[model samples]
Target: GSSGSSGNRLLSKYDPQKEAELRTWIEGLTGLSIGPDFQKGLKDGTILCTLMNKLQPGSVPKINRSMQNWHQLENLSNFIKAMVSYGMNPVDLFEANDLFESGNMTQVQVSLLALAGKAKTKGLQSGVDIGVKYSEKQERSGPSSG
Candidate 1:
């Protein structure tokens, strides 16, 4: 018999509207539907790699499609590296495990939102607006440090 303490585990909160907007934006960029399971669809990392390639030609030279866990992890890592290469802030990006294990979905949402914001700065107009905005960094002179 199971223990009486069984219940749903606590998870970080995410905005459904933003998720929906991101879904549309990704679909618009990749020309592929994510189906009903957004996280599962992206867990494989193929669509994400394709999206990066669309944003920057030759960004990801290879995209492997294999059922192997290592293959999927490699794809996810490749996407992160490519995004960082394209000037996305490393702090704003999510860890590969976050997506792979579905550990922290809110962080995943934040990372995607950051990506959308970065896209706006890159001048790539999306047919589906994510409604998130990113501004250019500002440099200022201050007192010298010791």
Candidate 2:
């Protein structure tokens, strides 16, 4: 009820404007929108595998089946570029090591899941806004416009 209380955010950090910009690059690559299902994947630590598969098809098997709990610098740049292109900063998204180091895979998963959720929500809201504007315009300009 208080104005200062920005209530009921799915994440601690949510900014519609920021998320809107994120949508352009985040979803553009993954081709999947973030939601509760996605958040669940984050908890389960599968989002990364899915993301890799999306970025470079057939990558899941390599990332998943290998015994190495390990690393890669190239996709670090690739992923960083992916996020940065969307007006996101690396620090805002995650730490450098979160990109590799299997010990923190879950941590990486959670951050991406949160971001996906936020970006998807922002995109959905924008779609609704556009739909409303189109409907209003149609109502005004329909057969009665004569």
Candidate 3:
């Protein structure tokens, strides 16, 4: 059978309170109703592919995730790098890395989940804002990235 859904994999480490923290945060943030599904997005390469293709047509399928090993980690970095090249704040693009010392999460997905939570608490949820923007509709700010 397939490996299973992201929630199925995460349940093994069940912590209702924290999970709720991220879940509620994610719901409010990206408005996906799914937890950090964005994590799985990059884990499998969908998000990565979209990013690559943005740089050049078909560059998405150019990656082969056969083993996905250390190269996978590099792929993640490359995903973030491509976002940077897209003219986004490397900070928001990689907030997970930035929140390490001041936060409980160290991964970008986690950072975003928490960020979504924080954003909701402040009454301005930007769901799908920090996640991938495969559709131009997901773009935040103005036409100027504004």
In candidate 2, how many Å is residue 28 off? Answer: 13
> What do the candidate models score in CA lDDT, each in turn?
0.69, 0.39, 0.38
Could you tally the backbone clashes for each prediction? 0, 0, 5
**Candidate 3 accuracy as lDDT:** 0.38
Tens-place lDDT digits, model 1, residues 31-138: 987778888888877787888787778567687799778788777877877766565664666777788888667877777776765665456433443344443443
Instruction: Put down candidate 2 lDDT per residue, 75-129, tens digits, no spaces.
Output: 3433443443333333445543554544344444435545454344433433222
Residue pairs clashing in model 1 are none
Please give the RMSD to the true structure for each candidate, in Å: 14.2, 16.6, 14.0
Better of 1 and 2 by lDDT: 1
Return the TM-score for candidate 2, rounded to 2 decimals. 0.34
Q: Kindly report which residue pairs in candidate 3 clash with one another.
A: 29-127, 30-127, 30-128, 141-146, 142-146
Least accurate 10 contiguous residues by lDDT in model 2? 131-140
Clashes in model 2: which pairs?
Answer: none
On the 0 to 100 scale, the lDDT of residue 2 in model 2 is 9
Alpha-carbon runs more than 4 Å astray in model 1: 1-13, 122-146
* Residue ranges of candidate 2 with Cα displaced over 4 Å: 1-71, 121-146
Candidate 3 all-Cα RMSD? 14.0
The best candidate by lDDT is 1
